[PDB]
Design an enzyme around this catalytic site. Structure first.
Site, PDB file in Angstrom:
ATOM      1  N   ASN A   1      17.582  -7.515   1.426  1.00  0.00           N
ATOM      2  CA  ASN A   1      16.154  -7.281   1.282  1.00  0.00           C
ATOM      3  C   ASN A   1      15.262  -8.518   1.398  1.00  0.00           C
ATOM      4  O   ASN A   1      14.173  -8.442   1.970  1.00  0.00           O
ATOM      5  CB  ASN A   1      15.862  -6.577  -0.031  1.00  0.00           C
ATOM      6  CG  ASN A   1      14.386  -6.328  -0.221  1.00  0.00           C
ATOM      7  OD1 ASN A   1      13.737  -6.983  -1.031  1.00  0.00           O
ATOM      8  ND2 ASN A   1      13.838  -5.395   0.549  1.00  0.00           N
TER       9      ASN A   1
ATOM     10  N   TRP B   1       3.436  -3.956  13.800  1.00  0.00           N
ATOM     11  CA  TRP B   1       4.682  -3.797  13.059  1.00  0.00           C
ATOM     12  C   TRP B   1       5.465  -2.523  13.325  1.00  0.00           C
ATOM     13  O   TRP B   1       6.622  -2.411  12.928  1.00  0.00           O
ATOM     14  CB  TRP B   1       4.476  -4.007  11.541  1.00  0.00           C
ATOM     15  CG  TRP B   1       3.537  -3.074  10.827  1.00  0.00           C
ATOM     16  CD1 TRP B   1       2.345  -3.403  10.248  1.00  0.00           C
ATOM     17  CD2 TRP B   1       3.743  -1.679  10.551  1.00  0.00           C
ATOM     18  NE1 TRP B   1       1.796  -2.307   9.624  1.00  0.00           N
ATOM     19  CE2 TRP B   1       2.632  -1.234   9.794  1.00  0.00           C
ATOM     20  CE3 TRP B   1       4.757  -0.762  10.870  1.00  0.00           C
ATOM     21  CZ2 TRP B   1       2.505   0.089   9.348  1.00  0.00           C
ATOM     22  CZ3 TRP B   1       4.631   0.556  10.426  1.00  0.00           C
ATOM     23  CH2 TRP B   1       3.510   0.966   9.672  1.00  0.00           C
TER      24      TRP B   1
ATOM     25  N   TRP C   1      -3.697  -6.439  17.531  1.00  0.00           N
ATOM     26  CA  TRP C   1      -2.334  -6.923  17.752  1.00  0.00           C
ATOM     27  C   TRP C   1      -2.198  -7.549  19.135  1.00  0.00           C
ATOM     28  O   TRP C   1      -2.620  -6.960  20.130  1.00  0.00           O
ATOM     29  CB  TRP C   1      -1.320  -5.781  17.623  1.00  0.00           C
ATOM     30  CG  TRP C   1      -1.386  -5.065  16.317  1.00  0.00           C
ATOM     31  CD1 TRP C   1      -1.913  -3.829  16.089  1.00  0.00           C
ATOM     32  CD2 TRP C   1      -0.938  -5.553  15.046  1.00  0.00           C
ATOM     33  NE1 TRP C   1      -1.823  -3.515  14.758  1.00  0.00           N
ATOM     34  CE2 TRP C   1      -1.230  -4.555  14.093  1.00  0.00           C
ATOM     35  CE3 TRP C   1      -0.322  -6.737  14.623  1.00  0.00           C
ATOM     36  CZ2 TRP C   1      -0.927  -4.703  12.734  1.00  0.00           C
ATOM     37  CZ3 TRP C   1      -0.020  -6.889  13.274  1.00  0.00           C
ATOM     38  CH2 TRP C   1      -0.324  -5.874  12.343  1.00  0.00           C
TER      39      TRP C   1
ATOM     40  N   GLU D   1      14.327  -1.099  -9.195  1.00  0.00           N
ATOM     41  CA  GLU D   1      14.503  -0.903  -7.759  1.00  0.00           C
ATOM     42  C   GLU D   1      14.514   0.584  -7.433  1.00  0.00           C
ATOM     43  O   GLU D   1      13.930   1.012  -6.438  1.00  0.00           O
ATOM     44  CB  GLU D   1      15.815  -1.537  -7.285  1.00  0.00           C
ATOM     45  CG  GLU D   1      15.926  -3.020  -7.572  1.00  0.00           C
ATOM     46  CD  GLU D   1      14.719  -3.793  -7.088  1.00  0.00           C
ATOM     47  OE1 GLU D   1      14.363  -3.653  -5.901  1.00  0.00           O
ATOM     48  OE2 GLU D   1      14.120  -4.538  -7.895  1.00  0.00           O
TER      49      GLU D   1
ATOM     50  N   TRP E   1      11.013   1.771  -7.433  1.00  0.00           N
ATOM     51  CA  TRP E   1      10.297   1.397  -6.210  1.00  0.00           C
ATOM     52  C   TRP E   1      10.654   2.396  -5.109  1.00  0.00           C
ATOM     53  O   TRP E   1       9.818   2.765  -4.285  1.00  0.00           O
ATOM     54  CB  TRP E   1      10.680  -0.022  -5.764  1.00  0.00           C
ATOM     55  CG  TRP E   1       9.829  -1.093  -6.385  1.00  0.00           C
ATOM     56  CD1 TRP E   1      10.126  -1.851  -7.482  1.00  0.00           C
ATOM     57  CD2 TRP E   1       8.517  -1.489  -5.967  1.00  0.00           C
ATOM     58  NE1 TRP E   1       9.078  -2.696  -7.772  1.00  0.00           N
ATOM     59  CE2 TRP E   1       8.077  -2.493  -6.859  1.00  0.00           C
ATOM     60  CE3 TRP E   1       7.668  -1.090  -4.925  1.00  0.00           C
ATOM     61  CZ2 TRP E   1       6.824  -3.106  -6.742  1.00  0.00           C
ATOM     62  CZ3 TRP E   1       6.420  -1.701  -4.805  1.00  0.00           C
ATOM     63  CH2 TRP E   1       6.010  -2.699  -5.712  1.00  0.00           C
TER      64      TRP E   1
ATOM     65  N   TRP F   1       7.520  -2.146   6.065  1.00  0.00           N
ATOM     66  CA  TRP F   1       6.695  -2.653   7.149  1.00  0.00           C
ATOM     67  C   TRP F   1       5.195  -2.589   6.873  1.00  0.00           C
ATOM     68  O   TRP F   1       4.437  -3.415   7.383  1.00  0.00           O
ATOM     69  CB  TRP F   1       7.051  -1.937   8.455  1.00  0.00           C
ATOM     70  CG  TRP F   1       8.373  -2.405   8.990  1.00  0.00           C
ATOM     71  CD1 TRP F   1       9.590  -1.799   8.831  1.00  0.00           C
ATOM     72  CD2 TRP F   1       8.624  -3.627   9.697  1.00  0.00           C
ATOM     73  NE1 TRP F   1      10.580  -2.570   9.394  1.00  0.00           N
ATOM     74  CE2 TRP F   1      10.014  -3.697   9.931  1.00  0.00           C
ATOM     75  CE3 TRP F   1       7.805  -4.670  10.153  1.00  0.00           C
ATOM     76  CZ2 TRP F   1      10.607  -4.770  10.605  1.00  0.00           C
ATOM     77  CZ3 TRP F   1       8.393  -5.737  10.821  1.00  0.00           C
ATOM     78  CH2 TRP F   1       9.782  -5.779  11.041  1.00  0.00           C
TER      79      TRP F   1
HETATM   80  C1  LIG Z   1      10.763  -4.420   6.241  1.00  0.00           C
HETATM   81  C2  LIG Z   1      11.784  -3.736   5.316  1.00  0.00           C
HETATM   82  C3  LIG Z   1      12.391  -2.529   5.707  1.00  0.00           C
HETATM   83  C4  LIG Z   1      13.239  -1.865   4.818  1.00  0.00           C
HETATM   84  N1  LIG Z   1      14.036  -0.838   5.322  1.00  0.00           N
HETATM   85  C5  LIG Z   1      14.688   0.006   4.407  1.00  0.00           C
HETATM   86  C6  LIG Z   1      15.363   1.158   4.997  1.00  0.00           C
HETATM   87  O1  LIG Z   1      15.182   1.636   6.117  1.00  0.00           O
HETATM   88  N2  LIG Z   1      16.163   1.866   4.086  1.00  0.00           N
HETATM   89  C7  LIG Z   1      16.387   1.541   2.731  1.00  0.00           C
HETATM   90  O2  LIG Z   1      16.887   2.316   1.963  1.00  0.00           O
HETATM   91  N3  LIG Z   1      15.624   0.478   2.268  1.00  0.00           N
HETATM   92  C8  LIG Z   1      14.828  -0.373   3.024  1.00  0.00           C
HETATM   93  N4  LIG Z   1      14.203  -1.540   2.526  1.00  0.00           N
HETATM   94  C9  LIG Z   1      14.292  -1.803   1.166  1.00  0.00           C
HETATM   95  C10 LIG Z   1      15.547  -2.675   0.884  1.00  0.00           C
HETATM   96  O3  LIG Z   1      15.552  -3.880   1.636  1.00  0.00           O
HETATM   97  C11 LIG Z   1      16.912  -2.000   0.628  1.00  0.00           C
HETATM   98  O4  LIG Z   1      16.917  -0.725  -0.023  1.00  0.00           O
HETATM   99  C12 LIG Z   1      18.111  -2.919   0.319  1.00  0.00           C
HETATM  100  O5  LIG Z   1      18.337  -3.940   1.298  1.00  0.00           O
HETATM  101  C13 LIG Z   1      19.373  -2.137   0.027  1.00  0.00           C
HETATM  102  O6  LIG Z   1      20.467  -2.978  -0.376  1.00  0.00           O
HETATM  103  P1  LIG Z   1      21.216  -2.549  -1.703  1.00  0.00           P
HETATM  104  O7  LIG Z   1      21.645  -1.121  -1.616  1.00  0.00           O
HETATM  105  O8  LIG Z   1      22.266  -3.537  -1.965  1.00  0.00           O
HETATM  106  O9  LIG Z   1      19.994  -2.684  -2.756  1.00  0.00           O
HETATM  107  P2  LIG Z   1      19.975  -2.896  -4.370  1.00  0.00           P
HETATM  108  O10 LIG Z   1      19.220  -4.105  -4.637  1.00  0.00           O
HETATM  109  O11 LIG Z   1      21.323  -2.747  -4.959  1.00  0.00           O
HETATM  110  O12 LIG Z   1      19.016  -1.696  -4.833  1.00  0.00           O
HETATM  111  C14 LIG Z   1      19.556  -0.387  -5.151  1.00  0.00           C
HETATM  112  C15 LIG Z   1      18.813   0.743  -4.429  1.00  0.00           C
HETATM  113  O13 LIG Z   1      17.395   0.700  -4.688  1.00  0.00           O
HETATM  114  C16 LIG Z   1      16.681   1.063  -3.473  1.00  0.00           C
HETATM  115  N5  LIG Z   1      15.776  -0.044  -3.081  1.00  0.00           N
HETATM  116  C17 LIG Z   1      15.910  -1.407  -3.273  1.00  0.00           C
HETATM  117  N6  LIG Z   1      14.898  -2.096  -2.821  1.00  0.00           N
HETATM  118  C18 LIG Z   1      13.929  -1.150  -2.602  1.00  0.00           C
HETATM  119  C19 LIG Z   1      12.626  -1.239  -2.034  1.00  0.00           C
HETATM  120  N7  LIG Z   1      12.065  -2.420  -1.791  1.00  0.00           N
HETATM  121  N8  LIG Z   1      12.097  -0.110  -1.412  1.00  0.00           N
HETATM  122  C20 LIG Z   1      12.748   1.083  -1.487  1.00  0.00           C
HETATM  123  N9  LIG Z   1      13.952   1.301  -2.062  1.00  0.00           N
HETATM  124  C21 LIG Z   1      14.517   0.117  -2.554  1.00  0.00           C
HETATM  125  C22 LIG Z   1      17.720   1.363  -2.385  1.00  0.00           C
HETATM  126  O14 LIG Z   1      17.967   2.754  -2.347  1.00  0.00           O
HETATM  127  C23 LIG Z   1      18.941   0.600  -2.907  1.00  0.00           C
HETATM  128  O15 LIG Z   1      20.216   1.036  -2.373  1.00  0.00           O
HETATM  129  C24 LIG Z   1      13.316  -2.257   3.432  1.00  0.00           C
HETATM  130  C25 LIG Z   1      12.651  -3.455   3.023  1.00  0.00           C
HETATM  131  C26 LIG Z   1      11.899  -4.185   3.936  1.00  0.00           C
HETATM  132  C27 LIG Z   1      11.089  -5.397   3.449  1.00  0.00           C
END
Ligand SMILES: Cc1cc2nc3c(=O)[nH]c(=O)nc-3n(C[C@H](O)[C@H](O)[C@H](O)COP(=O)(O)OP(=O)(O)OC[C@H]3O[C@@H](n4cnc5c(N)ncnc54)[C@H](O)[C@@H]3O)c2cc1C
Length: 474
Positions: free
Chosen positions: A348, A366, A313, A282, A285, A389
């Site tokens: 997520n 979007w 759109w 993660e 990513w 997005w």
């Molecule tokens: C449409 C959409 C918009 C999103 N908006 C954001 C946003 O504005 N800010 C944000 O930080 N993340 C965003 N995410 C990615 C993601 O959903 C989150 O980082 C997550 O919900 C954070 O919860 P957590 O800290 O418990 O994650 P955990 O699962 O504990 O992951 C740990 C860390 O990894 C990073 N991470 C995890 N998933 C991803 C990923 N897919 N992309 C990038 N970094 C990731 C984050 O920094 C997170 O705190 C988005 C995803 C989608 C599909």
């Protein structure tokens, strides 16, 4: 005298801070600072929850500096004017700060540095929020990655950096120095209300360096072992909830990596090991998207890939409004939007769903969704949000074949018992999970809950039709 100013932005902590540590090795007369920039604070894209979390982080940071021996200076205004003026009034030996990956921050930084150079003051900009800088991860041809797979293969093999030292025994400013800068300073940290904001929805993790560190340690001590497959279920509290701490740097990226790594070395179970590696993925990513924004700044403008820059759109404002108000009629979607607006955070899996819904089902550019998320996410982050997005349409990095999520299938798959649905849609606790998942609810039993605003099957065909017509037209 000759003090060094350290400019805080998204690294609100005293520990494991690259730039801060580098500055401390040059001088003990280390003075922190934070500038409330109107272009950011007054933005229609600023989320109240994010300001609340930020303000909470600044409060602790003031204490940390005080306990360290100096202080955190507070300013409100244009950075390229105020920062150089402050440095000059302080005859600063230099101004340090950590590099940004976003268009706005990088442009601003260039201007501050140039302003400082004119004033004859040294500006040092180091990488801190990424385990590996965008310039470190390149292909055999020296180019950035637009596909995850290869990026991960490179990133994974790179030696990982360790946490740097917390600065201590700092030297504070003198009255004469304080007098020289008085006009540029705020007398105290403004409260959320004074800034014109209000937030009462809580946070995924309490604001501050201390709370962030505690969460990281608690997560890596237990929950992380079940990350996979617990991460897939919104009903389960299977994620770290550290997102806002990472966005604002309440926690250092090296501390995070080291904690997960130590947990992997301590674990003697294959499943746990895998769970921890998955969590580490993660973080990879995260760097993939941040690096992408850095290398391809135009990504921030909207649909990246050519075909998508021309997508027809529909943009029915009413459908969008319904989406932002959690009145779509699709339980899984509405429960997610509610959690977002009420708590400033969304699981997520749910973000993936509501985004797919907004883009594929409602057929709305979007960017409206990206903007709405930024207006409500406590972790609102350009690189990650834009990545998410662009993902809902494969219009940016790591593109995949055309695909449209079926709300019912996702709901049944990731919230089989509708526990999450019922949690955020209590006025539907009486309904049977079976129906909440299918989204087919009888009017009477539906009470005041709206009916689906669109027929998924019809929207699916419509989207595919437009896609194909355009694909052909090209
Ligand atoms: C449409 C959409 C918009 C999103 N908006 C954001 C946003 O504005 N800010 C944000 O930080 N993340 C965003 N995410 C990615 C993601 O959903 C989150 O980082 C997550 O919900 C954070 O919860 P957590 O800290 O418990 O994650 P955990 O699962 O504990 O992951 C740990 C860390 O990894 C990073 N991470 C995890 N998933 C991803 C990923 N897919 N992309 C990038 N970094 C990731 C984050 O920094 C997170 O705190 C988005 C995803 C989608 C599909």
């Amino acid at each position: 005298a000759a003090p060094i100013l350290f400019w805080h932005r998204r690294d609100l902590r005293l520990s494991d801070n690259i730039g801060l540590a580098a500055a401390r090795a040059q001088s003990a007369q280390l003075i922190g600072l934070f500038c409330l920039d109107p272009q950011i604070l007054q933005s229609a894209d600023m989320a109240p929850a994010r300001v609340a979390y930020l303000q909470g982080c600044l409060q602790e940071l003031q204490q940390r500096y005080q306990q360290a021996g100096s202080r955190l200076l507070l300013l409100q205004g244009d950075p390229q004017h105020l920062i150089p003026q402050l440095a000059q009034q302080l005859q600063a030996e230099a101004v340090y700060w950590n590099q940004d990956i976003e268009p706005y921050g990088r442009d601003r930084d260039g201007q501050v540095a140039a302003a400082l150079k004119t004033a004859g003051i040294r500006a040092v900009q180091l990488w801190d929020q990424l385990l590996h800088s965008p310039d470190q991860i390149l292909s055999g041809s020296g180019n950035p990655y637009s596909v995850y797979g290869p990026f991960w293969k490179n990133w994974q093999a790179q030696p990982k950096p360790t946490p740097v030292a917390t600065p201590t025994e700092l030297v504070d400013l003198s009255p004469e120095q304080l007098t020289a800068i008085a006009p540029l300073l705020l007398s105290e940290l403004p409260t959320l209300k004074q800034l014109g904001f209000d937030w009462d929805g809580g946070f995924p993790v309490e604001p501050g360096e201390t709370a962030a560190i505690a969460r990281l340690q608690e997560f890596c001590d237990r929950a992380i072992a079940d990350y996979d497959p617990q991460r897939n279920f919104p009903a389960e509290a299977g994620t770290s909830g550290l997102s806002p701490a990472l966005k604002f740097g309440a926690i250092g990226i090296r501390q995070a990596w080291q904690a997960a790594s130590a947990a992997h070395a301590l674990s003697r179970s294959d499943e746990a090991r895998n769970s921890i590696r998955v969590w580490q993925q993660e973080l990879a990513w995260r760097e993939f998207y941040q690096h992408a924004l850095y290398h391809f700044p135009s990504l921030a403008d909207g649909p990246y890939r050519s075909l998508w820059q021309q997508f027809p759109w529909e943009n029915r404002e009413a459908l969008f409004t319904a989406w932002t108000q959690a009145q779509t009629g699709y339980p899984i979607v509405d429960a997610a939007m509610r959690q977002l607006t009420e708590t400033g955070w969304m699981h997520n899996r749910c973000r993936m769903i509501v985004a797919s819904f907004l883009t594929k089902d409602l057929i709305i550019d979007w960017r409206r969704g990206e903007q709405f998320f930024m207006q409500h996410l406590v972790d609102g982050d350009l690189a990650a949000n834009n990545g998410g997005w662009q993902w809902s349409a494969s219009s940016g990095m790591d593109p995949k074949p055309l695909r449209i999520f079926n709300p019912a299938s996702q709901a049944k798959k990731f919230d089989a018992t509708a526990t999450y649905i019922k949690r955020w849609l209590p006025e539907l606790r009486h309904v049977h999970p079976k129906d909440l998942i299918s989204g087919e609810i009888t009017p009477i039993e539906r009470r005041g809950y709206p009916a689906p605003i669109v027929n998924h099957n019809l929207r699916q065909k419509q989207f595919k039709a437009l896609y194909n017509q355009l694909k052909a037209a090209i």
